[PDB]
Amino acid sequence: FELSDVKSSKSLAEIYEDDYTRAALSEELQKAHSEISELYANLV
Amino acid sequence: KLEYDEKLKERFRHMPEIKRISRHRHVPQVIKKAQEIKNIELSSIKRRE
Amino acid sequence: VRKLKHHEQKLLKKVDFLEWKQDQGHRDTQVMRTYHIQNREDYHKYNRICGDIRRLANKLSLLPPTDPFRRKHEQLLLDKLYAMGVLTTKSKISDLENKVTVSAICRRRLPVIMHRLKMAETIQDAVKFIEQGHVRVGPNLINDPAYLVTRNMEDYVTWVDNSKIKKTLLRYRNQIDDFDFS
Amino acid sequence: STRLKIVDPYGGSDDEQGDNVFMFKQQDVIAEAFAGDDVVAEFQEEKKRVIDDEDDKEVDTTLPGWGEWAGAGSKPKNKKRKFIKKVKGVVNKDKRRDKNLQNVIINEKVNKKNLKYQSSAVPFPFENREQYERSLRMPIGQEWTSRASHQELIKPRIMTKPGQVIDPLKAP
Amino acid sequence: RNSWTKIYPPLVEHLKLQVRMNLKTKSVELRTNPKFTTDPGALQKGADFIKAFTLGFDLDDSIALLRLDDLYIETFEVKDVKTLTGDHLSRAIGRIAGKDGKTKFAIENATRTRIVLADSKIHILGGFTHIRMARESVVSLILGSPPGKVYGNLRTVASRLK
Amino acid sequence: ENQNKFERSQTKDKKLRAGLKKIDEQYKKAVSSAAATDYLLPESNGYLEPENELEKTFKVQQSEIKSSVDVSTANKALDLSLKEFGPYHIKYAKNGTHLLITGRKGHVASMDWRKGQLRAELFLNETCHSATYLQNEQYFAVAQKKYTFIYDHEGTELHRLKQHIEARHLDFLPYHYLLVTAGETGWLKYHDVSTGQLVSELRTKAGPTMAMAQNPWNAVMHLGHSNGTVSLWSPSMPEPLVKLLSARGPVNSIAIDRSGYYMATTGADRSMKIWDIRNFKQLHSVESLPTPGTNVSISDTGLLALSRGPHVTLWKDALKLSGDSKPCFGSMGGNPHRNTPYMSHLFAGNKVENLGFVPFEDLLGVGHQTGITNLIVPGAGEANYDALELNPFETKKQRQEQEVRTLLNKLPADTITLDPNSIGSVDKRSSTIRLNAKDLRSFLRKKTQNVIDERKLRVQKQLDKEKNIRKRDVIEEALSRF
Amino acid sequence: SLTWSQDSRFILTTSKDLSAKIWSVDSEEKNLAATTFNGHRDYVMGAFFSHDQEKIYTVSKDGAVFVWEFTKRKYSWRITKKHFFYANQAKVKCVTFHPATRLLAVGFTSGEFRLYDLPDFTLIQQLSM
């Protein structure tokens, strides 16, 4: 766990709304894989 | 040239950036600090007045 | 303009016409003027290589060091950079930040590989030879003097058959076996 | 006009050289324009939007539930005049220069960067802006005034002799 | 007064009741209208909404109490445990707030709840067992523990949360 | 007699009354002794007069005017006809010495023209839209395919521009050393050519810029869109400084007098407008011209020139405030109260691409499909240049001297308003009667700072409350005072 | 681009200059319509007749569709209806308009194409390549 030190920009209703809507490993890491793939292809 | 640009400085001495270039010196630190505290004393006594 | 005096340089110590802060300070034209690259805007390519490999190097290193995607793209990047031959020893992993520079990425060029192979006196006529089109690498002739001979092609960058320089080399050695054309 | 004249080997079957050029030039088929967007309407709309972004923008941000049982019916007796404050807009409506002119939209938002080139208050000798503008209304460099008038407009008020003693005056 | 424009439409047009801001005794009174207001607990939910807002949580937090009605609001004091003379009380509230609110925001993002704290009385709103988790972490921290240890304890409680 | 050209548009204190009398007397004396210089002006301007009634001024062509003109001007009347690159385009330098021509195929030539000194020719293989000099012969910019280039005086490519994503309208603000670009994307950007810095990137938000001119008098840039809007801009505000509704549809050309007062503007709906600028009044319209005139330019004397593709039409003195100098096209009904074309030339089958008046000689250069042609026009050049700024007889020494002086007197980029006489005033806080004051533990530190702040707030509130306090039936009369 | 009329009498020439011009094929009837529809913001990249050749659509770069019609205020060629494509940053890259079934196919510059039943301007089908 990371224990996010910032306040938020949400509410408890938005927290429980994301918990209601969530109900494919990590999307930021998927975006990182995609951008490093594009940059490696440009380099080659 | 010297009298012409001196007359230009005299005519434009109220513009703010050439005022803040023509004004400042390297006043020694003793005189600067003591004039600063004299200025805050005079502002305080004007407030009480 | 006119090698301004003291009282004019102090008023304008900022203006300069022939170089601005978009060419990274005469670097492109300086290294092109010393290293014979004929097509323009190629130190953009050289320094973009030497900055881009470190860019995606840190972009690959800040990834969490457990996933096999990291090992895959690390090994592909290192072996791709080794197979063209700017890295001599492939075992270097994270210290590609400091060594692969202009002086190494231009060391794969066919003029300096020619001069280190002692096929020419200097670069000044090595570019003349490989622009006249006397020098093949592998089976096919190569004419552009910005070619990077790779690792697996440095062994076979030799003169063509039926050329004046190959003829005069074999004449001076006096071994001109004239059955196979020269 | 359009189409006018090419006589190639492959082009211009008719339309040969008319060196007489009299009583045979009465076609005059003038092309006409179109009603593209009626841009007078677009210009009046942009002028109206800028005028609406003007005129001190006065806001009726009344007390929305204070005292008088707001919400869900119960329209009470009092008319809501509680907060009719006006923000200080840029120009009033009758002090712009677009009310007189036609099809001209100027916009007079003041420049934070050209704050820097005017004095904040008036100077000490010239007591108001009319005397200060009438003071600096005329330039003195040689690109805008003559040689004799320029050498009169520059000289110091105390023109001193260069290298000898200045005695106190003793005239009467 | 600065949040009154966002308070009353979830008290009038979303939720069906009507409001008055009484300047007589400086209070807020809420009626329910018999003609068209549904939801016979909406009066109590809107009352607890403005109660949380005037108690000290922010208005989006109070809207989060208004919607999703199963979030309650516990309150306790510093003075009940260890009796906390005033210097130690300053140590206590500074220790709970951390530096730039960072320990309080850590408890906030960890235990899926939101707290506010006055000079001697703190309030936690959320779901009930998350209230209990935040309350035991707060009372351990106000007994006085290393913040690294309470960070590790909140890592374990966040693992219970997942 | 001439003081309108040289004009520059009750008190208590006695010394200030005398000082005001001294300064406006010095104003009057300096204006009169500046107006008495055109007696010493070196030569007089040129003219072709009708001197009859049948001898109209526009039944005169290049053959007879080149016959009865000087040999030096007749040999200035060049024709650098080139055919293997496309429809050419003109820009003379700021002084009338060097010429810069541009073909739409790839050709850019910067060259002397009164001397046969071609000093920078360069072919390319991309469509070069327009080009203009920067300050000298030395640096000249070309608005190429998708990057603007600037070039040294022999032809070495000095700089590609990383910005200016494309460009088709590009010129120079001379005293500020500014290069102004407007492209087919909705942009207008300023790049200083001394420091190299970009200055501003003004998003136009009005479609592609169809035409552009420069005001010389206050260095505002005059865009003209496809809305019929003529907007005027400067890098102070990101919004357009003013807008105008000149024509309907798009406006293909716009041209400013060198005194900044008059604007000619020709649209695509067969329409021309004449505008005042300093009052923004539409002076007079011109309809009924047969084809939409693609390029208009304006002389240094008020002698404007429409360019309708095959035709070029020059009107003399069509910028007055009257209804008589409206530029018409034919004298009908025996009406000497019109304004016919002062002269006109009709090229063969090639559409004229752009105009440009030569600065300090009597000739109008026009560029078209097959190349260049200059037209001898007697009144359309300012005769008497002023040698402290522009000089058609430069040397290397004085060229470098003017370079270093203008680089020392580079006006900063903020100083271009709608009216450049407005940098001496007070800043809209005038007070004509000026009130000159004569006639009116870190928690604990933060907590004490909040205490002192709250006390300052309460003292401020009490002083304002005291200021407001200082500046402001029978039975109840008996039942008062309780 | 060019488009032909159904009969061989009129062509619509759409250009990078913002005019879309209608040009007649023979000079004997040139006085019918040599007009120049302006109005689009940036480049007009198509111009098509309808089936009954009384309506002329013109489609722009930014995504405007203009319906020119010969109605009143002699009286000539006003713009009776304007449609918008509302792609975010995908300008119009190619167009065609089959008139016999009123089908307008528009492919944008981001691999997308939409296609419309034009006189009501309903989106029949939208996808991306």
PDB file of C-alpha atoms in Angstrom, chain F residues 139-259:
ATOM      1  CA  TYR F 139      19.234  38.995 -43.339  1.00  0.00           C
ATOM      2  CA  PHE F 140      16.116  38.120 -45.275  1.00  0.00           C
ATOM      3  CA  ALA F 141      13.293  35.814 -44.247  1.00  0.00           C
ATOM      4  CA  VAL F 142      11.291  33.512 -46.514  1.00  0.00           C
ATOM      5  CA  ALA F 143       7.946  31.962 -45.551  1.00  0.00           C
ATOM      6  CA  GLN F 144       8.534  28.540 -47.068  1.00  0.00           C
ATOM      7  CA  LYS F 145       6.513  25.295 -47.120  1.00  0.00           C
ATOM      8  CA  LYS F 146       6.085  24.610 -43.422  1.00  0.00           C
ATOM      9  CA  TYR F 147       8.997  26.322 -41.657  1.00  0.00           C
ATOM     10  CA  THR F 148      10.023  29.944 -42.008  1.00  0.00           C
ATOM     11  CA  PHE F 149      13.707  30.324 -42.822  1.00  0.00           C
ATOM     12  CA  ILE F 150      15.963  33.342 -42.401  1.00  0.00           C
ATOM     13  CA  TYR F 151      19.044  33.693 -44.571  1.00  0.00           C
ATOM     14  CA  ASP F 152      22.390  35.469 -44.605  1.00  0.00           C
ATOM     15  CA  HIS F 153      23.296  37.895 -47.396  1.00  0.00           C
ATOM     16  CA  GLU F 154      24.987  35.282 -49.591  1.00  0.00           C
ATOM     17  CA  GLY F 155      22.530  32.423 -49.217  1.00  0.00           C
ATOM     18  CA  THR F 156      23.588  30.290 -46.269  1.00  0.00           C
ATOM     19  CA  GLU F 157      20.528  29.014 -44.425  1.00  0.00           C
ATOM     20  CA  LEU F 158      20.898  30.836 -41.128  1.00  0.00           C
ATOM     21  CA  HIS F 159      17.844  29.543 -39.289  1.00  0.00           C
ATOM     22  CA  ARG F 160      14.931  27.261 -39.716  1.00  0.00           C
ATOM     23  CA  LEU F 161      12.259  28.314 -37.239  1.00  0.00           C
ATOM     24  CA  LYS F 162      11.034  25.572 -34.903  1.00  0.00           C
ATOM     25  CA  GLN F 163       7.857  27.573 -34.345  1.00  0.00           C
ATOM     26  CA  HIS F 164       5.737  29.129 -37.134  1.00  0.00           C
ATOM     27  CA  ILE F 165       4.098  25.805 -38.003  1.00  0.00           C
ATOM     28  CA  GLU F 166       3.382  27.268 -41.385  1.00  0.00           C
ATOM     29  CA  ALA F 167       3.443  30.769 -42.777  1.00  0.00           C
ATOM     30  CA  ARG F 168       1.973  32.712 -45.621  1.00  0.00           C
ATOM     31  CA  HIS F 169       2.026  36.333 -44.426  1.00  0.00           C
ATOM     32  CA  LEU F 170       5.296  37.537 -42.966  1.00  0.00           C
ATOM     33  CA  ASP F 171       6.926  40.922 -42.501  1.00  0.00           C
ATOM     34  CA  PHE F 172       9.012  43.067 -40.174  1.00  0.00           C
ATOM     35  CA  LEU F 173       8.601  45.755 -37.531  1.00  0.00           C
ATOM     36  CA  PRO F 174      11.832  47.677 -38.093  1.00  0.00           C
ATOM     37  CA  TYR F 175      12.586  49.753 -35.010  1.00  0.00           C
ATOM     38  CA  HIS F 176      11.748  46.918 -32.632  1.00  0.00           C
ATOM     39  CA  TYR F 177      13.609  44.251 -34.673  1.00  0.00           C
ATOM     40  CA  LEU F 178      10.429  42.163 -34.765  1.00  0.00           C
ATOM     41  CA  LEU F 179       9.405  39.471 -37.246  1.00  0.00           C
ATOM     42  CA  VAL F 180       5.651  38.966 -37.508  1.00  0.00           C
ATOM     43  CA  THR F 181       4.115  35.766 -38.873  1.00  0.00           C
ATOM     44  CA  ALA F 182       0.534  34.883 -39.766  1.00  0.00           C
ATOM     45  CA  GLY F 183      -0.240  31.475 -41.183  1.00  0.00           C
ATOM     46  CA  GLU F 184      -3.012  29.227 -42.435  1.00  0.00           C
ATOM     47  CA  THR F 185      -3.590  27.917 -38.954  1.00  0.00           C
ATOM     48  CA  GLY F 186      -5.264  30.482 -36.748  1.00  0.00           C
ATOM     49  CA  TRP F 187      -2.099  31.978 -35.271  1.00  0.00           C
ATOM     50  CA  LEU F 188      -0.108  35.185 -35.245  1.00  0.00           C
ATOM     51  CA  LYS F 189       3.297  35.050 -33.628  1.00  0.00           C
ATOM     52  CA  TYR F 190       6.051  37.555 -32.911  1.00  0.00           C
ATOM     53  CA  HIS F 191       9.721  36.577 -32.957  1.00  0.00           C
ATOM     54  CA  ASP F 192      12.422  39.094 -32.155  1.00  0.00           C
ATOM     55  CA  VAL F 193      15.360  38.709 -34.522  1.00  0.00           C
ATOM     56  CA  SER F 194      17.923  40.275 -32.189  1.00  0.00           C
ATOM     57  CA  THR F 195      17.610  38.293 -28.964  1.00  0.00           C
ATOM     58  CA  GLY F 196      16.134  35.314 -30.801  1.00  0.00           C
ATOM     59  CA  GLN F 197      13.282  35.012 -28.312  1.00  0.00           C
ATOM     60  CA  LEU F 198       9.677  34.448 -29.181  1.00  0.00           C
ATOM     61  CA  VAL F 199       7.629  37.314 -27.761  1.00  0.00           C
ATOM     62  CA  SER F 200       4.014  36.222 -28.083  1.00  0.00           C
ATOM     63  CA  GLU F 201       1.782  33.603 -29.710  1.00  0.00           C
ATOM     64  CA  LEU F 202      -1.569  35.317 -30.239  1.00  0.00           C
ATOM     65  CA  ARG F 203      -4.299  32.787 -31.004  1.00  0.00           C
ATOM     66  CA  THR F 204      -6.401  34.469 -33.671  1.00  0.00           C
ATOM     67  CA  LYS F 205      -9.658  32.463 -33.258  1.00  0.00           C
ATOM     68  CA  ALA F 206     -11.057  33.778 -36.545  1.00  0.00           C
ATOM     69  CA  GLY F 207     -10.031  31.297 -39.209  1.00  0.00           C
ATOM     70  CA  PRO F 208      -7.037  31.537 -41.514  1.00  0.00           C
ATOM     71  CA  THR F 209      -5.488  34.936 -42.049  1.00  0.00           C
ATOM     72  CA  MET F 210      -6.414  35.958 -45.581  1.00  0.00           C
ATOM     73  CA  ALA F 211      -4.343  39.139 -45.681  1.00  0.00           C
ATOM     74  CA  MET F 212      -2.078  41.292 -43.557  1.00  0.00           C
ATOM     75  CA  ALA F 213      -0.499  44.718 -43.562  1.00  0.00           C
ATOM     76  CA  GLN F 214       1.712  46.608 -41.132  1.00  0.00           C
ATOM     77  CA  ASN F 215       1.077  50.036 -39.806  1.00  0.00           C
ATOM     78  CA  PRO F 216       4.339  51.992 -39.922  1.00  0.00           C
ATOM     79  CA  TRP F 217       3.226  54.684 -37.537  1.00  0.00           C
ATOM     80  CA  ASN F 218       2.444  52.561 -34.483  1.00  0.00           C
ATOM     81  CA  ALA F 219       3.622  49.052 -35.527  1.00  0.00           C
ATOM     82  CA  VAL F 220       0.271  47.375 -35.009  1.00  0.00           C
ATOM     83  CA  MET F 221      -0.411  44.417 -37.267  1.00  0.00           C
ATOM     84  CA  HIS F 222      -3.533  44.470 -39.414  1.00  0.00           C
ATOM     85  CA  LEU F 223      -4.972  41.039 -40.095  1.00  0.00           C
ATOM     86  CA  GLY F 224      -7.899  40.412 -42.385  1.00  0.00           C
ATOM     87  CA  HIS F 225      -9.852  37.186 -42.048  1.00  0.00           C
ATOM     88  CA  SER F 226     -12.476  35.244 -43.966  1.00  0.00           C
ATOM     89  CA  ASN F 227     -15.165  36.855 -41.800  1.00  0.00           C
ATOM     90  CA  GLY F 228     -14.630  40.228 -43.435  1.00  0.00           C
ATOM     91  CA  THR F 229     -13.122  41.291 -40.126  1.00  0.00           C
ATOM     92  CA  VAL F 230     -10.071  43.518 -40.279  1.00  0.00           C
ATOM     93  CA  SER F 231      -8.526  43.082 -36.850  1.00  0.00           C
ATOM     94  CA  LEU F 232      -5.633  45.071 -35.418  1.00  0.00           C
ATOM     95  CA  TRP F 233      -3.237  43.377 -32.995  1.00  0.00           C
ATOM     96  CA  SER F 234      -0.145  43.930 -30.850  1.00  0.00           C
ATOM     97  CA  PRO F 235       1.602  41.694 -28.251  1.00  0.00           C
ATOM     98  CA  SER F 236       0.166  43.543 -25.261  1.00  0.00           C
ATOM     99  CA  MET F 237      -3.201  41.841 -25.119  1.00  0.00           C
ATOM    100  CA  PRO F 238      -3.900  38.298 -26.347  1.00  0.00           C
ATOM    101  CA  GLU F 239      -7.239  39.546 -27.628  1.00  0.00           C
ATOM    102  CA  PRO F 240      -7.345  41.570 -30.853  1.00  0.00           C
ATOM    103  CA  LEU F 241      -6.850  45.230 -30.065  1.00  0.00           C
ATOM    104  CA  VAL F 242      -9.689  46.364 -32.328  1.00  0.00           C
ATOM    105  CA  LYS F 243     -11.860  44.787 -35.008  1.00  0.00           C
ATOM    106  CA  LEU F 244     -13.495  46.194 -38.137  1.00  0.00           C
ATOM    107  CA  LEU F 245     -16.076  44.923 -40.602  1.00  0.00           C
ATOM    108  CA  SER F 246     -14.492  45.870 -43.914  1.00  0.00           C
ATOM    109  CA  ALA F 247     -16.040  43.651 -46.566  1.00  0.00           C
ATOM    110  CA  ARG F 248     -18.292  40.616 -46.891  1.00  0.00           C
ATOM    111  CA  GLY F 249     -16.817  37.173 -47.263  1.00  0.00           C
ATOM    112  CA  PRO F 250     -13.029  37.255 -47.106  1.00  0.00           C
ATOM    113  CA  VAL F 251     -10.760  40.250 -47.586  1.00  0.00           C
ATOM    114  CA  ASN F 252      -7.889  39.516 -49.940  1.00  0.00           C
ATOM    115  CA  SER F 253      -5.828  42.627 -49.432  1.00  0.00           C
ATOM    116  CA  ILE F 254      -5.231  45.494 -47.050  1.00  0.00           C
ATOM    117  CA  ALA F 255      -2.696  48.293 -47.182  1.00  0.00           C
ATOM    118  CA  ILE F 256      -1.776  51.107 -44.810  1.00  0.00           C
ATOM    119  CA  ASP F 257      -0.504  54.581 -45.612  1.00  0.00           C
ATOM    120  CA  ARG F 258       2.934  55.329 -44.193  1.00  0.00           C
ATOM    121  CA  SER F 259       1.385  58.046 -42.011  1.00  0.00           C
TER     122      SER F 259
END
